[PDB]
Design an enzyme around this catalytic site. Structure first.
Site, PDB file in Angstrom:
ATOM      1  N   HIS A  11       0.832  -1.216   0.000  1.00 29.33           N
ATOM      2  CA  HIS A  11       0.000   0.000   0.000  1.00 29.33           C
ATOM      3  C   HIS A  11       0.872   1.274   0.000  1.00 29.33           C
ATOM      4  O   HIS A  11       0.590   2.210  -0.761  1.00 29.33           O
ATOM      5  CB  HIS A  11      -0.940   0.005   1.233  1.00 29.33           C
ATOM      6  CG  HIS A  11      -1.888   1.169   1.321  1.00 29.33           C
ATOM      7  ND1 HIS A  11      -3.209   1.049   0.933  1.00 29.33           N
ATOM      8  CD2 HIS A  11      -1.707   2.393   1.864  1.00 29.33           C
ATOM      9  CE1 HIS A  11      -3.776   2.218   1.189  1.00 29.33           C
ATOM     10  NE2 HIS A  11      -2.914   3.060   1.750  1.00 29.33           N
ATOM     11  N   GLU A  12       1.884   1.335   0.900  1.00 27.45           N
ATOM     12  CA  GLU A  12       2.752   2.523   0.995  1.00 27.45           C
ATOM     13  C   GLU A  12       3.539   2.744  -0.311  1.00 27.45           C
ATOM     14  O   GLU A  12       3.551   3.866  -0.853  1.00 27.45           O
ATOM     15  CB  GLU A  12       3.701   2.449   2.226  1.00 27.45           C
ATOM     16  CG  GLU A  12       2.970   2.280   3.561  1.00 27.45           C
ATOM     17  CD  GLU A  12       1.820   3.242   3.834  1.00 27.45           C
ATOM     18  OE1 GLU A  12       1.784   4.348   3.242  1.00 27.45           O
ATOM     19  OE2 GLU A  12       0.890   2.835   4.558  1.00 27.45           O
TER      20      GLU A  12
ATOM     21  N   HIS B  71       1.371   4.175  -3.034  1.00 21.79           N
ATOM     22  CA  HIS B  71       1.301   5.657  -3.012  1.00 21.79           C
ATOM     23  C   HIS B  71       2.560   6.211  -3.661  1.00 21.79           C
ATOM     24  O   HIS B  71       2.463   7.123  -4.485  1.00 21.79           O
ATOM     25  CB  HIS B  71       1.230   6.178  -1.581  1.00 21.79           C
ATOM     26  CG  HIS B  71      -0.104   6.058  -0.940  1.00 21.79           C
ATOM     27  ND1 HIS B  71      -1.255   6.600  -1.529  1.00 21.79           N
ATOM     28  CD2 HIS B  71      -0.432   5.502   0.250  1.00 21.79           C
ATOM     29  CE1 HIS B  71      -2.232   6.376  -0.664  1.00 21.79           C
ATOM     30  NE2 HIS B  71      -1.786   5.712   0.422  1.00 21.79           N
TER      31      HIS B  71
ATOM     32  N   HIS C 198      -6.047   6.406  -2.891  1.00 24.29           N
ATOM     33  CA  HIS C 198      -6.923   5.383  -2.316  1.00 24.29           C
ATOM     34  C   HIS C 198      -8.064   5.020  -3.244  1.00 24.29           C
ATOM     35  O   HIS C 198      -8.558   5.876  -4.006  1.00 24.29           O
ATOM     36  CB  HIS C 198      -7.494   5.825  -0.980  1.00 24.29           C
ATOM     37  CG  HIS C 198      -6.490   5.853   0.125  1.00 24.29           C
ATOM     38  ND1 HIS C 198      -6.687   6.622   1.241  1.00 24.29           N
ATOM     39  CD2 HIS C 198      -5.307   5.209   0.235  1.00 24.29           C
ATOM     40  CE1 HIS C 198      -5.619   6.435   2.002  1.00 24.29           C
ATOM     41  NE2 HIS C 198      -4.774   5.564   1.446  1.00 24.29           N
TER      42      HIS C 198
HETATM   43  C1  LIG Z   1      -1.945  -0.574   5.122  1.00 21.81           C
HETATM   44  C2  LIG Z   1      -3.002   0.552   5.445  1.00 21.81           C
HETATM   45  C3  LIG Z   1      -4.204   0.548   4.541  1.00 21.81           C
HETATM   46  C4  LIG Z   1      -2.379   1.936   5.623  1.00 21.81           C
HETATM   47  C5  LIG Z   1      -3.433   2.883   6.156  1.00 21.81           C
HETATM   48  C6  LIG Z   1      -2.943   4.380   6.270  1.00 21.81           C
HETATM   49  C7  LIG Z   1      -2.547   4.986   4.948  1.00 21.81           C
HETATM   50  O1  LIG Z   1      -3.402   5.414   4.157  1.00 21.81           O
HETATM   51  N1  LIG Z   1      -1.225   4.787   4.735  1.00 21.81           N
HETATM   52  O2  LIG Z   1      -0.888   5.116   3.415  1.00 21.81           O
HETATM   53  C8  LIG Z   1      -3.784   2.573   7.630  1.00 21.81           C
HETATM   54  O3  LIG Z   1      -2.901   2.489   8.479  1.00 21.81           O
HETATM   55  N2  LIG Z   1      -5.157   2.477   7.838  1.00 21.81           N
HETATM   56  C9  LIG Z   1      -5.758   2.268   9.137  1.00 21.81           C
HETATM   57  C10 LIG Z   1      -6.442   0.921   9.234  1.00 21.81           C
HETATM   58  O4  LIG Z   1      -7.370   0.590   8.473  1.00 21.81           O
HETATM   59  N3  LIG Z   1      -5.899   0.142  10.270  1.00 21.81           N
HETATM   60  C11 LIG Z   1      -6.409  -1.206  10.608  1.00 21.81           C
HETATM   61  C12 LIG Z   1      -5.419  -2.356  10.790  1.00 21.81           C
HETATM   62  C13 LIG Z   1      -6.957  -0.900  11.955  1.00 21.81           C
HETATM   63  O5  LIG Z   1      -6.188  -0.925  12.889  1.00 21.81           O
HETATM   64  N4  LIG Z   1      -8.299  -0.608  12.006  1.00 21.81           N
HETATM   65  C14 LIG Z   1      -8.967  -0.295  13.251  1.00 21.81           C
HETATM   66  C15 LIG Z   1     -10.463   0.016  13.117  1.00 21.81           C
HETATM   67  N5  LIG Z   1     -10.771   1.073  14.087  1.00 21.81           N
HETATM   68  C16 LIG Z   1      -6.698   3.500   9.420  1.00 21.81           C
HETATM   69  C17 LIG Z   1      -5.964   4.897   9.336  1.00 21.81           C
HETATM   70  C18 LIG Z   1      -7.917   3.625   8.451  1.00 21.81           C
HETATM   71  C19 LIG Z   1      -7.172   3.346  10.889  1.00 21.81           C
HETATM   72 ZN   LIG Z   2      -2.906   5.058   2.095  1.00 20.19          ZN
END
Ligand SMILES: CC(C)C[C@H](CC(=O)NO)C(=O)N[C@H](C(=O)N[C@@H](C)C(=O)NCCN)C(C)(C)C
Ligand SMILES: [Zn+2]
Length: 254
Positions: free
Chosen positions: A185-186, A189, A195
Site C-alpha cells: 500500500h505505501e 502511493h 486510495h
Molecule cells: C496498510 C493501510 C491501509 C495503511 C493505512 C494508512 C494509509 O493510508 N497509509 O498510506 C492505515 O494504516 N489504515 C488504518 C487501518 O485501516 N488500520 C487497521 C489495521 C486498523 O487498525 N483498524 C482499526 C479500526 N478502528 C486507518 C488509518 C484507516 C485506521
Molecule cells: Zn494510504
C-alpha cells in the site's frame, strides 16, 4: 517496457525499534525478514499489468539495508527519526506518523537523492491503528525518483521519495501477511496510486466479489482474493507514473 529501466531500487532502513523487536537484536534476523518481505511485495508489482496487456515486469529490489542497532543520541531539543524518544509526545509509544515521515526524509536526504525510494521499517504503535505513511498519490507531491522539497524549518532540501511501515499495531507484532499489505500500500502511493473510493465498485468490490484491493483506505486483514492486488483505479494512476518515471530513476533488475 525497457528491461534496462524496470526496477525501482530501494534504500531500506531498519531503526533500533525494528532491530530489537523484529530482529531480536540480530542483523541476520533483521535483514532476512526485510529481504523476504520486499521479494513478496515485488511479486505483486512485477506481475501487475499496468495497462492490462504487456506493460508488466516493473518491480522493486533492495539496493541497501541500513541497520540501526541502537538509538540515535541527540542534543537537547534536537530530533532524529532513530532517537530513543517518540515525538512530539515522549509519553506515547510512537511518533505522530506525519512528523516521523518528514523527520526520516530530512535525516536520510543525502542517501535518498541517490536512490529510487527510501523506506523506513519501524516498530511503534501509531495512534488509532495507523500502519504506515508515504509521499505520492495524495489528493502534495512525491513518490518514485527523488523530488526536492525545500524545508523552511529544516533549512535544506529533503526528497519526497520516501515512505514508512510499522510492524506493531495495537500492542503486538502484525502478521507477515499483514506487513506485506502495508508495504505494498505505501509503495503503491509512492508509485502514484491514490486510495480506492467506495463510489467505484470496480475499484472497491464487495466481499462476495473478491473483497477490497490493496489501495483501499481501511486495512484489509489479507484473507480476501483482491486484498493483495491493485485495482484498475490504482493501475490507471500508476501506469501514468511508470511511463514518466522509469526512464528517470529505474534500473536493470539484478
Ligand atoms: C496498510 C493501510 C491501509 C495503511 C493505512 C494508512 C494509509 O493510508 N497509509 O498510506 C492505515 O494504516 N489504515 C488504518 C487501518 O485501516 N488500520 C487497521 C489495521 C486498523 O487498525 N483498524 C482499526 C479500526 N478502528 C486507518 C488509518 C484507516 C485506521
Ligand atoms: Zn494510504
Amino acid at each position: 517496457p525497457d528491461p534496462m529501466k524496470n526496477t525501482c531500487k530501494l534504500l531500506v532502513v531498519a531503526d533500533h525499534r525494528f532491530y530489537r523487536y523484529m530482529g531480536r537484536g540480530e542483523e541476520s534476523t533483521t535483514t532476512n525478514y526485510l529481504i523476504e518481505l520486499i521479494d513478496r511485495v515485488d511479486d505483486i508489482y512485477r506481475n501487475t499489468a499496468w495497462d492490462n496487456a504487456g506493460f508488466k515486469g516493473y518491480g522493486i529490489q533492495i539496493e541497501q539495508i541500513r541497520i540501526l542497532k541502537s538509538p540515535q543520541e541527540v542534543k537537547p531539543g534536537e530530533k532524529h527519526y532513530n532517537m530513543a524518544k517518540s515525538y512530539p509526545n515522549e509519553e506515547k509509544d510512537a511518533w505522530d506518523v506525519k512528523m516521523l515521515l518528514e523527520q526520516f526524509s530530512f535525516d536520510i536526504a543525502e542517501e535518498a537523492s541517490k536512490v529510487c525510494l527510501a523506506h523506513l521499517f519501524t516498530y511503534q504503535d501509531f495512534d488509532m491503528g495507523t500502519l504506515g505513511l508515504a509521499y505520492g498519490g495524495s489528493p502534495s507531491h512525491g513518490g518514485v525518483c527523488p523530488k526536492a522539497y525545500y524545508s523552511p524549518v529544516g533549512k535544506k532540501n529533503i526528497y519526497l521519495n520516501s515512505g514508512l511501515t510499522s510492524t506493531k499495531n495495537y500492542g503486538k507484532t502484525i502478521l507477515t501477511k499483514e506487513a506485506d499489505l502495508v508495504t505494498t500500500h505505501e509503495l503503491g502511493h509512492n508509485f502514484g496510486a491514490e486510495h480506492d473510493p467506495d463510489g467505484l465498485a470496480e475499484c472497491a468490490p464487495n466481499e462476495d466479489q473478491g473483497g477490497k484491493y490493496v489501495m483501499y483506505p481501511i486495512a484489509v486483514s489479507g484473507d480476501h482474493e483482491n486484498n493483495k492486488m491493485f485495482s484498475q483505479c490504482s493501475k490507471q494512476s500508476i501506469y501514468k507514473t511508470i511511463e514518466s518515471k522509469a526512464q528517470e530513476c529505474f534500473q536493470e533488475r539484478s
